[PDB]
Design a binder for this molecule. Structure first.
Ligand SMILES: Nc1nc(O)c2nc(CNc3ccc(C(=O)O)cc3)cnc2[nH+]1
Length: 262
């Protein structure tokens, strides 16, 4: 498994771009692509994971473990106490995958410790733990991510709110930013400040699977049926072609079957 290292304590937008660029290049299937957009790989493809080491300020680091097939965060780890590696697996991880999060995050079986994420990765759960009806109320931003890392990295006890807040922010600035060019650009336009995720960034996150299927199944560039998304103002946004949603998409969820590759 490879790890993409990103210095959150000291960056520029070009470094952010390079980061996502490296995570996409690593996550994507070396050949799967529909309409010129890279597609994630089939679950049987190896490696099945990719790590993202987030280096905050004050020597506070957190490593994220992502599944390559759908870019989902399965858990995270942080340097703890002396030679310890504290892994936190999402509660929606099951079977062998739970051993995979533990061993892939903390290879040294001798010094690794467990600290379970007692809830799933679904936004409504994360939002509920963060104590917000919508993640739109939790601003995203570099300095913010850095600050959330510091509240967890090495700290024995943090609340589910503190934890959910870190997750919400990290999930969107990492995997959601990698999945969508639009989301990356939003972060870069507000690189030096805190910003609330707009209706389009959130909708994109919620309709990624549909968009990916729709584009995979697209005929000549025509979406099987009209896809109803929402723009930045929160207005209805009906897409009929791949050219209309493609600019905002960097990676497509793995969708089984052949497709118009270009
Ligand atoms: N990076 C990452 N990691 C995960 O573990 C993860 N899990 C999910 C499932 N849950 C959800 C819940 C709500 C919505 C939504 O409200 O749009 C979309 C997906 C989605 N997106 C995810 N992204």
């Amino acid at each position: 498994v490879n790890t993409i290292i990103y210095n959150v304590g000291s960056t520029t937008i070009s470094k952010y771009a390079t980061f996502l660029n490296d995570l996409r290049n690593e996550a994507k299937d070396p050949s799967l692509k529909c309409y010129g957009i890279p597609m994630l790989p089939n679950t049987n493809t190896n490696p099945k994971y990719v790590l993202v080491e987030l280096q905050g300020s004050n020597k506070k680091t957190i490593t994220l473990m992502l599944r390559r097939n759908n870019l989902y965060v399965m858990g995270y780890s942080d340097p703890f106490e002396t030679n310890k590696c504290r892994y936190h697996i999402f509660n929606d991880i099951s079977g062998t995958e739970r051993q995979d999060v533990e061993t892939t995050l903390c290879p040294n079986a001798n010094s690794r410790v467990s600290k379970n994420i007692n809830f799933d990765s679904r936004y409504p759960t994360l939002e509920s733990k963060a104590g917000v009806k919508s993640r739109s109320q939790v601003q995203l931003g570099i300095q913010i991510l850095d600050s959330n890392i510091g509240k967890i990295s090495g700290v024995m006890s943090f609340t589910e709110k503190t934890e959910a807040e870190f997750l919400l922010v990290a999930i969107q600035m990492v995997s959601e930013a990698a999945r969508f060019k639009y989301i990356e650009n939003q972060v870069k336009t507000n690189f030096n400040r805190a910003f609330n995720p707009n209706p389009k960034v959130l909708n994109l996150q919620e309709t990624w699977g549909k968009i990916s299927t729709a584009i995979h199944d697209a005929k000549n560039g025509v979406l099987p049926k009209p896809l109803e998304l929402v723009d930045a103002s929160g207005a209805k946004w009906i897409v009929l072609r791949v050219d209309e949603i493609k600019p905002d998409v960097a990676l497509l969820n793995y969708v089984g079957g052949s497709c118009q590759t270009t």
